Amino acid sequence: TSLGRSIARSMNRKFHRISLGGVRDEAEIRGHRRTYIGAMPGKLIHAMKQVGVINPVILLDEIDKMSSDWRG
Amino acid sequence: DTNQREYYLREQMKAIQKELGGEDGLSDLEALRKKIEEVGMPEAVKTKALKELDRLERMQQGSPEATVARTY
Amino acid sequence: DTNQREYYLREQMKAIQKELGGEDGLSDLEALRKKIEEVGMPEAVKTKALKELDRLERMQQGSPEATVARTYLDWLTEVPWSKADPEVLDINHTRQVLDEDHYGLKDVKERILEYLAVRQLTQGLDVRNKAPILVLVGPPGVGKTSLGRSIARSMNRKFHRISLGGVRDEAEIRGHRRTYIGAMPGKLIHAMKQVGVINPVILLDEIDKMSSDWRGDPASAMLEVLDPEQNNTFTDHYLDVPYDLSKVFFITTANTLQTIPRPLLDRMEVIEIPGYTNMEKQAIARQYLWPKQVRESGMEGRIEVTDAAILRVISEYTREAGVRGLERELGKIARKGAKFWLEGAWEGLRTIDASDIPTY
Amino acid sequence: LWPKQVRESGMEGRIEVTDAAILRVISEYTREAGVRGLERELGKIARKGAKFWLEGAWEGLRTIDASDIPTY
Amino acid sequence: DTNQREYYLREQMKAIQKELGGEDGLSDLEALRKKIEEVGMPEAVKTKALKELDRLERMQQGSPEATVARTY
Amino acid sequence: TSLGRSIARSMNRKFHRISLGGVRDEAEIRGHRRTYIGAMPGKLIHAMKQVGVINPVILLDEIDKMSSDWRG
Amino acid sequence: RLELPVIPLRNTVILPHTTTPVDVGRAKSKRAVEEAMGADRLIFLVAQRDPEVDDPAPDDLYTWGVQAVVKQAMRLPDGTLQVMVEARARAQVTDYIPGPYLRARGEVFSEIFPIDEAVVRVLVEELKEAFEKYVANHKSLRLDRYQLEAVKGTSDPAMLADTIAYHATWTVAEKQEILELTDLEARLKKVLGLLSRDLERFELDKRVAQRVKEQM
Numbered sequence: 056t057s058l059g060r061s062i063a064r065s066m067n068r069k070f071h072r073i074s075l076g077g078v079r080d081e082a083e084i085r086g087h088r089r090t091y092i093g094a095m096p097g098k099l100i101h102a103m104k105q106v107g108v109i110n111p112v113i114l115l116d117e118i119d120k121m122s123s124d125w126r127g
Numbered sequence: 128d129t130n131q132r133e134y135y136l137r138e139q140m141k142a143i144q145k146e147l148g149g150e151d152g153l154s155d156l157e158a159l160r161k162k163i164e165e166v167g168m169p170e171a172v173k174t175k176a177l178k179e180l181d182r183l184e185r186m187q188q189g190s191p192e193a194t195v196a197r198t199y
Numbered sequence: 200d201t202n203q204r205e206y207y208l209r210e211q212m213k214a215i216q217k218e219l220g221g222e223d224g225l226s227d228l229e230a231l232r233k234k235i236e237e238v239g240m241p242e243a244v245k246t247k248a249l250k251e252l253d254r255l256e257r258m259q260q261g262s263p264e265a266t267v268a269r270t271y272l273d274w275l276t277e278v279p280w281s282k283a284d285p286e287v288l289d290i291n292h293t294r295q296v297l298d299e300d301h302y303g304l305k306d307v308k309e310r311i312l313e314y315l316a317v318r319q320l321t322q323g324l325d326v327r328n329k330a331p332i333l334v335l336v337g338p339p340g341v342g343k344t345s346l347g348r349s350i351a352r353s354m355n356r357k358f359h360r361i362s363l364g365g366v367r368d369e370a371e372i373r374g375h376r377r378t379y380i381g382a383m384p385g386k387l388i389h390a391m392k393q394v395g396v397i398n399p400v401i402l403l404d405e406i407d408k409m410s411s412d413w414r415g416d417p418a419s420a421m422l423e424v425l426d427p428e429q430n431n432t433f434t435d436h437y438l439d440v441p442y443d444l445s446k447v448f449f450i451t452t453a454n455t456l457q458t459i460p461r462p463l464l465d466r467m468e469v470i471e472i473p474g475y476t477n478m479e480k481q482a483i484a485r486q487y488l489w490p491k492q493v494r495e496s497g498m499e500g501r502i503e504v505t506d507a508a509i510l511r512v513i514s515e516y517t518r519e520a521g522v523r524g525l526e527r528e529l530g531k532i533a534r535k536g537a538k539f540w541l542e543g544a545w546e547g548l549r550t551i552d553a554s555d556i557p558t559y
Numbered sequence: 560l561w562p563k564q565v566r567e568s569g570m571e572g573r574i575e576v577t578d579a580a581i582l583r584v585i586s587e588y589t590r591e592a593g594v595r596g597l598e599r600e601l602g603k604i605a606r607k608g609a610k611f612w613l614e615g616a617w618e619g620l621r622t623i624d625a626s627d628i629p630t631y
Numbered sequence: 632d633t634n635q636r637e638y639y640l641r642e643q644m645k646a647i648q649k650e651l652g653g654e655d656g657l658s659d660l661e662a663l664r665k666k667i668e669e670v671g672m673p674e675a676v677k678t679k680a681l682k683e684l685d686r687l688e689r690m691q692q693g694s695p696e697a698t699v700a701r702t703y
Numbered sequence: 704t705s706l707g708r709s710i711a712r713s714m715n716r717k718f719h720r721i722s723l724g725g726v727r728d729e730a731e732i733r734g735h736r737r738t739y740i741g742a743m744p745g746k747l748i749h750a751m752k753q754v755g756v757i758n759p760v761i762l763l764d765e766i767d768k769m770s771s772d773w774r775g
Numbered sequence: 776r777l778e779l780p781v782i783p784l785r786n787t788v789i790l791p792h793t794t795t796p797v798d799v800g801r802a803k804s805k806r807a808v809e810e811a812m813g814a815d816r817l818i819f820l821v822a823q824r825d826p827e828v829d830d831p832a833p834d835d836l837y838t839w840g841v842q843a844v845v846k847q848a849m850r851l852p853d854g855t856l857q858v859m860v861e862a863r864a865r866a867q868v869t870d871y872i873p874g875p876y877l878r879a880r881g882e883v884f885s886e887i888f889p890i891d892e893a894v895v896r897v898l899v900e901e902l903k904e905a906f907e908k909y910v911a912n913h914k915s916l917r918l919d920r921y922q923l924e925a926v927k928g929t930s931d932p933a934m935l936a937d938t939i940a941y942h943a944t945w946t947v948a949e950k951q952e953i954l955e956l957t958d959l960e961a962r963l964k965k966v967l968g969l970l971s972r973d974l975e976r977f978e979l980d981k982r983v984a985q986r987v988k989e990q991m
């Protein structure tokens with residue numbers, strides 16, 4: 056992660072990261088079709104939202120720590 | 128006379144509109160329309176946003192679907 | 200000129216809303232506006248309240264734009280702003296406090312001594328830690344909450360408690376966009392409203408007994424509401440303009456280190472608090488547990504328990520590592536004493552002893 | 560790594576570590592393949608040094624040899 | 632012309648449905664006014680009830696305000 | 704239940720029971736959001752309304768026959 | 776002047792240099808009117824507070840007593856002695872001597888003419904134009920034209936300032952703040968600011984009325 060911070064600093068764009076490990080479904084990346092209060096998109100949309108620029112340097116954290124049993 | 132006065136005071140209440148306080152807002156979902164216009168987006172995004180903005184302004188009270196539309 | 204014209208708007212609406220169709224708002228939006236633009240809170244409150252002015256002036260009954268308006272106004276203007284109780288910064292004060300309130304293991308005290316020694320050396324021309332948050336791991340009965348209370352008393356801060364073993368979705372610790380009544384800000388804003396100052400010691404209970412039953416794992420929200428360099432400019436969904444959680448203390452508690460979320464395991468200094476020994480539990484009872492029962496049940500000068508009976512109760516009536524089972528046993532002793540006193544006391548000070556404990 | 564610890568724990572210019580003690584910490588106090596363990600050990604060293612300095616500053620500049628590590 | 636005449640006539644129908652005496656359009660309305668007062672409620676409850684009392688003075692075929700106000 | 708009634712007699716209060724077998728919604732327990740006519744308040748609120756006393760004795764029978772699901 | 780009879784003013788302070796009738800209904804004030812008839816038509820008018828006490832009090836008065844030369848004193852049998860008083864200038868009230876009837880001693884007029892009278896005349900002209908615009912636009916807000924006609928052709932700038940200040944409608948605390956200002960330009964600036972505030976409120980009223988008719 057500190058290497059990613061250094062890379063982003065060299066590129067002079069604001070670093071970010073998202074703990075995509077421990078996500079057990081496809082729903083946490085795509086969200087779900089909005090039909091109630093508390094309708095929430097995926098993690099990536101959150102990451103892009105809190106980084107107010109369209110060209111960040113996002114670090115997909117722990118990409119090998121996912122599970123796939125239900126909800127896609 | 129009571130009905131006429133009630134209509135007159137409702138019109139006066141709508142007129143308040145908050146003026147300088149209402150510069151952001153304009154009866155609600157207007158600042159949102161302007162910010163739709165302000166942010167340069169793909170034309171499909173513009174069309175979808177305008178379509179669901181038309182789907183908005185439908186008496187949010189008693190209709191949380193308007194709330195989820197505003198969340199979108 | 201802007202303020203006086205808005206004052207005129209206030210006057211007209213407080214004269215008019217008396218006959219307004221929606222009375223669920225109570226026509227109190229103008230009464231509550233005395234903290235919109237007569238505000239003793241910073242510019243953030245003023246900006247939102249200017250935006251909150253738009254949210255006013257509508258009807259009720261089912262998803263009101265005005266009930267949510269006044270609710271958000273009250274939430275914004277009741278959470279303390281720029282008001283801090285005078286904290287004393289000492290470690291020797293804590294040296295005496297951790298002796299006047301607990302028998303103590305004398306091992307967990309020194310970890311909090313270390314952390315507080317760090318807390319005095321707040322440098323960088325400001326106060327920022329970037330350091331762990333006193334995660335306490337141990338049984339429930341063991342005095343986690345009392346340790347937090349003693350620390351708060353030592354530093355003269357209002358202790359609190361908000362359980363996190365009952366949270367399952369990112370909405371009881373987060374907020375919801377203010378557009379309708381029926382949505383509540385998170386438990387942390389609840390705790391902030393419970394206190395009247397900006398720097399309250401807060402405890403967090405059973406974090407390891409929290410799961411993602413519904414869509415959304417509360418762990419990420421926990422990490423965001425707690426990281427003491429990103430939460431200084433933080434709001435959940437319910438609030439809009441950032442409210443700082445940097446000055447706010449955060450001590451935590453759990454039972455095991457396995458179910459604590461991995462992202463939360465950052466900036467955690469494990470302070471392991473084991474159980475107690477029979478002699479230590481006996482001292483705890485004879486000093487702070489049995490006297491507690493005595494003046495709780497109403498035994499001022501009524502009954503006294505010999506140390507033999509206390510150790511017999513400890514070795515017989517409770518095996519759990521905490522001091523909760525012993526506390527309940529002594530409370531039921533107090534109940535039975537309340538009876539055996541209520542049919543007439545043979546003397547001003549009755550005597551409890553190991554001979555007839557199974558009678559009590 | 561150590562300078563960041565000391566700059567955070569309020570002890571700059573008021574504690575030192577003879578880097579033989581750093582070797583001791585690495586060889587005894589951390590067996591992981593990275594530096595997070597080393598950074599936790601040095602954080603504990605910083606906090607305990609702050610505590611010891613808080614019982615009365617006995618010097619204008621501290622020092623830590625390799626022997627007294629299982630005292631700090 | 633016909634709609635104005637119809638509003639006129641229906642309004643005398645409203646102005647003659649006051650049970651002749653004119654004390655209240657419906658007995659249920661005047662019952663809640665005293666029932667709120669004749670019950671000793673705290674300042675948090677009584678004061679608010681005195682303001683949702685204003686939702687009354689409605690009748691079934693008119694505004695549906697009293698339909699749930701009476702139940703509350 | 705008869706022990707509860709006897710305690711109420713001895714305590715000189717008003718016994719009252721509200722069954723809690725097969726309850727999953729807070730709307731069943733307490734009030735639901737004030738949607739107009741329809742969506743009546745819940746069980747314990749009705750129990751509190753039934754008695755004319757502010758200090759009653761409430762017997763929550765089969766309290767271990769509950770259930771926790773969505774909607775409160 | 777000193778130890779002159781005091782008549783409490785009705786619902787507001789009567790500013791100097793303005794042709795205003797003052798009601799006198801209570802007998803306690805009637806006795807002071809009778810005693811002022813023995814002081815060569817000169818009354819040291821000290822006003823009482825906002826909504827009044829039925830009897831004058833030695834603590835509810837104001838700290839500024841205006842000395843007025845009475846143009847005429849007409850008597851009525853209805854119960855009120857409406858006196859036509861044309862005042863001169865404000866003066867400070869030292870303290871309160873209780874009655875009834877009340878008494879209060881003062882000093883010479885507090886209105887003074889400072890240096891740099893060119894700025895004084897410039898501000899007088901600017902305030903006159905501002906008040907003409909204020910009155911002319913305030914026809915829907917019911918501003919009289921006799922008030923605008925009574926401010927033209929004035930010699931003393933204090934006369935113009937006080938006459939315009941009375942003819943413009945606001946609260947009593949701001950009138951007290953104006954009367955406190957003994958500077959010839961500070962009072963003009965305060966009147967200008969108050970007129971600007973009222974004209975901004977008027978513009979807001981016009982805009983919201985236009986919105987109402989558009990909605991209609």
Ligand SMILES: Nc1ncnc2c1ncn2[C@@H]1O[C@H](COP(=O)(O)OP(=O)(O)O)[C@@H](O)[C@H]1O
Nearest residue numbers: 300301302303339340341342343344345487522
């Ligand atoms: N040194 C000590 N060790 C354990 N318990 C203590 C000690 N000193 C006092 N107590 C008492 O033990 C009780 C522990 O109960 P409690 O604080 O409710 O546990 P928890 O809140 O962690 O579940 C406290 O009420 C406290 O007064």
